[PDB]
Enzyme design. Structure first.
Site, PDB file in Angstrom:
ATOM      1  N   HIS A  55      -2.400  -0.577   4.637  1.00  0.00           N
ATOM      2  CA  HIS A  55      -1.671  -0.330   3.688  1.00  0.00           C
ATOM      3  C   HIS A  55      -1.631  -1.356   2.479  1.00  0.00           C
ATOM      4  O   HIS A  55      -1.967  -1.299   1.284  1.00  0.00           O
ATOM      5  CB  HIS A  55      -0.227   0.153   3.724  1.00  0.00           C
ATOM      6  CG  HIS A  55       0.404   0.834   2.778  1.00  0.00           C
ATOM      7  ND1 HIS A  55      -0.183   1.220   1.700  1.00  0.00           N
ATOM      8  CD2 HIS A  55       1.682   0.901   2.603  1.00  0.00           C
ATOM      9  CE1 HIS A  55       0.718   1.705   0.820  1.00  0.00           C
ATOM     10  NE2 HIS A  55       1.857   1.616   1.562  1.00  0.00           N
ATOM     11  N   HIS A  66      -1.214  -0.594  -7.076  1.00  0.00           N
ATOM     12  CA  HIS A  66      -0.475   0.432  -6.291  1.00  0.00           C
ATOM     13  C   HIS A  66      -0.063   1.797  -6.727  1.00  0.00           C
ATOM     14  O   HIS A  66       0.878   1.685  -7.473  1.00  0.00           O
ATOM     15  CB  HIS A  66       0.715  -0.296  -5.467  1.00  0.00           C
ATOM     16  CG  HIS A  66       1.275   0.477  -4.312  1.00  0.00           C
ATOM     17  ND1 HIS A  66       2.493   0.961  -4.396  1.00  0.00           N
ATOM     18  CD2 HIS A  66       0.458   1.229  -3.339  1.00  0.00           C
ATOM     19  CE1 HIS A  66       2.793   1.701  -2.996  1.00  0.00           C
ATOM     20  NE2 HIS A  66       1.438   1.827  -2.636  1.00  0.00           N
ATOM     21  N   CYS A  90       4.953   6.973  -2.175  1.00  0.00           N
ATOM     22  CA  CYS A  90       4.074   6.003  -1.477  1.00  0.00           C
ATOM     23  C   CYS A  90       2.975   6.714  -0.502  1.00  0.00           C
ATOM     24  O   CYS A  90       2.004   5.957  -0.180  1.00  0.00           O
ATOM     25  CB  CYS A  90       4.441   4.854  -1.134  1.00  0.00           C
ATOM     26  SG  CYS A  90       5.532   3.936  -2.459  1.00  0.00           S
TER      27      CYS A  90
END
Lengths: 1105, 67
Positions: free
Chosen positions: A293, A331, A161
């Site tokens: 984020h 994402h 990530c």
């Protein structure tokens, strides 16, 4: 150290084939997370129905990147897309990839999954060895370094990530410390294996709604999305376009946390942000927009936003914009950083902030949102000004953070050189690519930085890109022209033309070009002593101005030197040079054996000595008579002056003999025309009288001779005597003899190689026809100037473009003043313009391949292919037909043997049904089939409970005799009356069978129930169930009877096809016969023997009251 | 501020533990994903420095040492 910048950018994010589409989707607000079945059938395993997905992974320009096709199939899609994306990114910043070759540029690539590695390595016996070279996670960076020839570090990070932003930070540290001068940072993530999504769901990160409702009150999870972005970061010195400047970048790890390994920590994030903005020297109030984020996790969002509140929102007045790019595209797990960077850079480029989708009720746990200290970008707001931030927090506890200073170089003030025409050249794999580049360039005929960048990245060898094309922008006319460039290096030749080519105001257009003006001004200085100004002569409009020989010679020399200089700027070194009479001096300069002043002085003194002599008038004319024939035909006083061509010759002498010979030849019909000598004898004995004074003057002019090179072939000394003293050096004596000596021009031509490119360096391409006639047909010619043209600069640029199409590389940017850098903001992106060759489909892993005995799911949804089963209702509940069991077992056997169903005659024996499977109205039921080839036995089970058992095997030798209709039990019913469809299914309803339209396939039946005609809608289940309906129809036993045992069944599809026939309508029908004596039911190509039915309970609940 | 750099080039255990979709436990991805090979160490030992796992194709260890 040195400033570090984000030079380029490129990628293929969800629902976007290029970043242009990405921005178009973002600003347009269109949600980029879809609900299609591309990666795997939706709703599987309870996985989220919606996720972000790319558009096509099955395309890759294999040939260009030097991957042999077999290894192309077995290469991970991530790497196949990443090679293209990286190449596109490098050329986005207008940097030719060949320049970086040999440098220490690095490739930091953030990849968290290698799903394709398992896919190509699941069958040990037949797995190919190439997979490791193109699938092993390490090869993600090594492959890029190998193609582009990068000698710097080659890594592949794995922090989840946050791999992309970590790679960007590492590249920043590398370039910042001076280790590497350029870097290619990239991230890749492709969703192929559903088991990973299942894992994430089991962890609780995924949001069931499939929307990353960032910062909202109802934040649940994030939707997986796949993208491949790459970025080129180089030092400030080599940059062409600077999207932004990386003031600082750093990272830290969360360390121990009470909640758990997967609980993000806000204090660490605040510390990281504060440390970065303090160390870098950036004021806290400077920030404008921070790309939080924004994972949408109920826990992560408040933590991160409160951390940002403490780190930046503590003591500032103007509100700080906060946004999240994951609310649009989802994402991208390992590529999240680069996607956010792409969004930020696009927003800076276009002057607006992309709004955030799915934000209605602000979250209460983040006070800053309600108090207004932080503002979400709900609508497109114009960018105001200041620094920018970015941060990705991978769930492993690795935090990164980058400070970006946007590039705000304003467009240059207009300049006169903007008015002048510019040349453009583009290259690409296929003609569509070249046309795309040229069209986009023409759409920006004023952005000089864009044009210069495009010209720079056009220098590629023909083999790499086999199509080129040029387009002149701003010219009075002229469209684009794109033609394939034949393979092979080609030579380039200069040919300088001689007298007569001067005209009124020749070259006036080129004087606007700086280099040509400098050349002509130097010439004007060089010829100062004698009162003649080359520039003044060129401007002078008097028609008689070029009547004098002196002016003509000086002007020709000056123009030719200017053209040689203009070509010289582009970096073109001729391989061969062949001049013609005067202007061979221009060739002398071209080689380097003469100086510009030396050449111009030689030309002027030649001319002046021409005047001083005062020779008798003399005219030279072109005679169609060949060189051999003409000479013997020449009368006294006239000789072959110039052997221009076999078909065309020139001979001179006294004017009267010339006129007499020309008239006589015209009587004979041969070609004849007097060249504009002005009355001065050319290359004849007349010039003999001049040599002594001319030799004196020339000895004066050139004092330190130089040696003629092997390139230039003396068209004045015959080929025989090329080892003489005169031929060695083009001294005054050489030019003197050249003046006197005849013009053996054609003979010198032969030594031109095949395919060579000839340039006519001269004001007027008078000789272009002659060169065409007397040169190998494979050659190519280019004028570079034409008499009385509208704008000779346009023609010269067109010639340079045609030269570009012909193989050589002559970058035109150098002609005009160099464009200041870095490129001003707003210059349209170059990455979307590049088009590849995607005419072949390369393989991609499928869902079946990834691991998770035939299983058949029966779905009765209207879209499901098994919806016809909704019409098999017995006693008010849908039941799976016995013929359905037969059909599924048949398909499984077919798959086992490899054949198709229609080519597999099968035999069933000792078929027993144990329990009836009830299809529920909603959901699905799974059926499992297992075969035992050795024992010829099968077995069907559901949830581990046996449903059907028996023996099935292929029929070795079919016998059509078997399906002949057996003797009827009643030979002569002699009853014209017969049951129709409605009556048949009325009777079956009364018994208890409730059949729907699909299973109603008895067009007629005999009263006794022995014969009838069945429909054939191309479905075996329905056909065989119709046969069983016929069997049950004649039964005298009232009640619901269902099959429990069938002794033997035989199916031969070939006989089935041969038995069918069509009625008056288009429907097909197959006759059916039932014999109770033999207990056989024969229909079409189906034989059923030994049926047995057991009275069902017939009891149904909730009966009508 | 101590950091961790781990040279790893395989995650076969991850392939093994994700074989079955119906019966795969979520916390497998915490303890088998390549990234966790360094994040787990950073978590236990409370290290605030960089945390990285790099393949580098058979030079992972000496690469990590160089970093």
């Amino acid at each position: 150290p040195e400033e570090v910048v984000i030079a380029g950018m490129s990628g293929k994010l969800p629902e976007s084939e290029n970043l242009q589409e990405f921005w178009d989707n973002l600003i347009g607000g269109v949600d980029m997370v879809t609900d299609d079945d591309r990666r795997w059938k939706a709703g599987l395993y309870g996985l989220p129905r919606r996720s972000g997905k790319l558009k096509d992974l099955s395309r890759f320009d294999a040939s260009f990147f030097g991957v042999h096709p077999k290894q192309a199939h077995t290469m991970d899609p991530q790497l196949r897309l990443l090679l293209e994306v990286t190449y596109e990114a490098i050329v986005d910043g207008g940097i030719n990839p060949d320049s970086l070759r040999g440098t220490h540029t690095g490739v930091w690539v953030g990849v968290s999954g290698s799903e394709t590695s398992e896919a190509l390595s699941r069958d040990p016996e037949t797995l190919v060895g190439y997979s490791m070279v193109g699938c092993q996670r390490a090869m993600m960076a090594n492959r890029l370094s190998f193609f582009f020839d990068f000698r710097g570090p080659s890594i592949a990070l794995d922090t989840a990530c946050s791999s992309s932003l970590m790679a960007l930070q590492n590249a920043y540290q590398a370039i910042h410390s001076g280790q590497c001068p350029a870097a290619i940072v990239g991230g890749i993530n492709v969703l192929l294996k559903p088991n990973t999504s299942v894992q994430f769901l089991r962890l609780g990160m995924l949001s069931p709604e499939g929307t990353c409702k960032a910062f909202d009150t109802a934040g649940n999870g994030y939707c997986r999305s796949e993208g491949v972005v790459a970025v080129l970061l180089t030092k400030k010195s080599l940059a062409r376009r600077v999207y932004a400047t990386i003031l600082n970048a750093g990272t830290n790890t969360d360390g121990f946390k009470e909640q758990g390994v997967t609980f993000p920590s806000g204090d660490i994030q605040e510390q990281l942000i504060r440390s970065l903005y303090q160390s870098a020297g950036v004021a806290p109030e400077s920030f404008e927009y921070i790309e939080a984020h924004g994972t949408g996790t109920k826990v992560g969002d408040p933590q991160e936003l409160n951390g940002i509140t403490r780190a930046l929102c503590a003591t500032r007045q103007e509100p700080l914009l906060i946004g999240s790019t994951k609310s649009n595209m989802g994402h991208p797990e390992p590529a999240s950083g680069l996607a956010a960077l792409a969004k930020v850079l696009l927003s800076l480029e276009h002057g607006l902030w992309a709004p955030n989708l799915h934000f209605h009720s602000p979250n209460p746990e983040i006070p800053a949102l309600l108090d207004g200290r932080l503002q979400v970008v709900d609508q497109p707001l114009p960018v105001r000004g200041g620094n920018v931030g970015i941060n990705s927090f991978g769930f492993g506890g690795s935090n990164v953070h980058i400070i970006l200073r946007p590039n705000t170089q304003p467009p240059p003030a207009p300049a006169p050189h903007a008015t002048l025409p510019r040349l453009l050249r583009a290259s690409g794999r296929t003609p569509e690519a070249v046309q795309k580049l040229l069209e986009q360039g023409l759409r920006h005929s004023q952005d000089l930085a864009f044009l210069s960048m495009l010209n720079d990245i056009a220098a590629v060898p023909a083999t790499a890109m086999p199509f080129r094309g040029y387009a002149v922008l701003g010219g009075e006319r002229g469209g684009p022209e794109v033609q394939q460039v034949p393979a092979g290096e080609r030579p380039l030749w200069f040919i300088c033309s001689g007298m007569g080519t001067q005209w009124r105001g020749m070259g006036l257009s080129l004087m606007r070009l700086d280099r040509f003006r400098d050349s002509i001004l130097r010439s004007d200085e060089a010829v100062k002593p004698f009162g003649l100004k080359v520039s003044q002569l060129l401007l002078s409009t008097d028609e008689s101005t070029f009547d004098d020989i002196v002016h003509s010679f000086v002007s020709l020399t000056a123009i030719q030197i200017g053209l040689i200089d203009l070509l010289s700027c582009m970096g073109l070194r001729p391989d061969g040079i062949v001049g013609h009479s005067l202007g061979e001096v221009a060739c002398g300069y071209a080689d380097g054996c003469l100086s510009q002043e030396e050449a111009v002085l030689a030309a002027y003194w030649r001319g002046q000595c021409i005047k001083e002599a005062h020779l008798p008038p003399g005219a030279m004319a072109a005679v169609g008579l060949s060189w051999e024939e003409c000479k013997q035909r020449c009368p006294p006083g006239v000789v072959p002056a110039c052997h221009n061509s076999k078909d065309t010759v020139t001979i001179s002498g006294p004017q009267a003999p010339v006129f007499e010979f020309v008239e006589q030849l015209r009587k004979e019909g041969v070609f004849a025309k007097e060249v504009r000598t002005g009355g001065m004898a050319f290359h004849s004995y007349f010039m003999e009288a001049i040599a002594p004074p001319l030799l004196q003057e020339l000895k004066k002019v050139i004092r330190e001779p130089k040696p003629r090179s092997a390139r230039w072939l003396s068209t004045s000394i015959p080929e025989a005597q090329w080892h003489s003293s005169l031929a060695r050096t083009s001294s005054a004596e050489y030019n003197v003899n050249n003046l006197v000596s005849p013009v053996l021009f054609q003979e010198a031509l032969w030594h031109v190689p095949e395919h060579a490119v000839v340039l006519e360096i001269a004001p007027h391409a008078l000789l272009q026809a002659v060169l065409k006639r007397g040169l190998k047909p494979s050659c190519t010619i280019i004028p570079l100037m034409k008499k009385d043209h509208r704008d000779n600069l346009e023609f010269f640029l067109a010639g340079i473009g045609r030269l570009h199409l012909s193989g050589i590389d002559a970058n035109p940017n150098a002609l005009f003043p160099p464009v200041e850098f870095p490129a001003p903001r707003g210059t349209p992106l170059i990455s979307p313009l590049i088009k590849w060759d995607h005419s072949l489909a390369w393989d991609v892993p499928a869902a079946e391949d990834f691991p998770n005995a035939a299983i058949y799911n029966i779905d009765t949804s209207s879209e499901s292919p098994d919806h016809y089963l909704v019409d098999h209702t017995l006693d008010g509940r849908v039941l799976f037909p016995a013929t359905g069991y037969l059909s599924i077992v048949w398909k499984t056997l077919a798959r086992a043997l490899g054949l198709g169903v229609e080519q597999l005659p099968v035999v069933f024996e000792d078929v027993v049904l144990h329990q009836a499977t009830i299809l529920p109205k909603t959901g699905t039921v799974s059926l499992e089939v297992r075969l035992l080839e050795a024992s010829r036995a099968f077995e069907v089970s559901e949830n581990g409970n046996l449903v059907v058992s028996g023996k099935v095997y292929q029929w070795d030798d079919p016998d059509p005799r078997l399906f002949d209709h057996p003797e009827s039990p009643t030979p002569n019913p002699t009853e014209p009356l017969f049951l129709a469809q409605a009556e048949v299914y009325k009777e079956l309803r009364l018994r208890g069978y409730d059949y729907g339209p699909h299973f109603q396939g008895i067009l007629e039946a005999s009263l006794e129930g022995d014969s009838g005609r069945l429909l054939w809608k191309d479905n075996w289940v329905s056909f065989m169930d119709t046969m069983l309906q016929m069997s049950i129809l004649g039964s005298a036993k009232h009640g619901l009877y269902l099959p429990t045992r069938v002794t033997a069944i035989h199916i031969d599809p070939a006989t089935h096809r041969q038995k069918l026939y069509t009625l008056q309508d288009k429907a097909q029908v197959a006759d059916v016969v039932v014999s109770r004596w033999l207990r056989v039911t024969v229909a079409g190509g189906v034989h059923i023997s030994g049926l047995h039915t057991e009275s069902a309970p017939r009891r149904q609940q909730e009966q009508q009251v």
